[PDB]
Design a protein around this ligand. Sequence first.
Ligand SMILES: C[C@H](NC(=O)[C@H](C)NC(=O)[C@H](Cc1cc(-c2ccccc2)no1)CP(=O)(O)c1ccc(Br)cc1)C(N)=O
Ligand SMILES: [Ca+2]
Ligand SMILES: [Ca+2]
Ligand SMILES: [Ca+2]
Ligand SMILES: [Zn+2]
Ligand SMILES: [Zn+2]
Length: 152
Amino acid sequence: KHYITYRINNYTPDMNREDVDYAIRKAFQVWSNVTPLKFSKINTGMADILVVFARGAHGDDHAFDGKGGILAHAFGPGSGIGGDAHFDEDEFWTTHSGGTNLFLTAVHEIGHSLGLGHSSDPKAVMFPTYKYVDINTFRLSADDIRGIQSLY
Ligand SMILES: C[C@H](NC(=O)[C@H](C)NC(=O)[C@H](Cc1cc(-c2ccccc2)no1)CP(=O)(O)c1ccc(Br)cc1)C(N)=O
Ligand SMILES: [Ca+2]
Ligand SMILES: [Ca+2]
Ligand SMILES: [Ca+2]
Ligand SMILES: [Zn+2]
Ligand SMILES: [Zn+2]
């Protein structure tokens, strides 16, 4: 199906609540812009993709590892934790270059939420390693486009 819902379960205290909403909205928009996917934000109740901030062990057999290392993870589409995107609260989430940029990380993780694996293109958002790029000139690489359009 092309209609997919999300809910921001909780908000990192690192950031303004409004900035988390915006970063997440823009991350979904990135993928919506290159597919027929329609995303809808839910405030309360059942949603396909939950956006969660948590530290250490947090219920899903994939515990986080403290500051650094693994920044976030996400599960491919399914029931329950399927589709959910988890961000390690031990990171320092930001709208800027400092710490770990939430928008960029969210684009990567939503990619996983939708069923993508990793890319071999070093410029792809789905390359395995986080790298800050200038947010205002950010673009999905042609390989990201191939990946997502193959699924939707
Ligand atoms: C501290 C920071 N760490 C990272 O970038 C690390 C390597 N990457 C991760 O934390 C992966 C998550 C990530 C990648 C990106 C990104 C952003 C922009 C461009 C390219 C990539 N954003 O988040 C972890 P994952 O979701 O792939 C994951 C895979 C397997 C398991 Br099991 C669990 C999770 C760094 N190396 O700068
Ligand atoms: Ca889910
Ligand atoms: Ca970590
Ligand atoms: Ca934090
Ligand atoms: Zn998790
Ligand atoms: Zn990844």
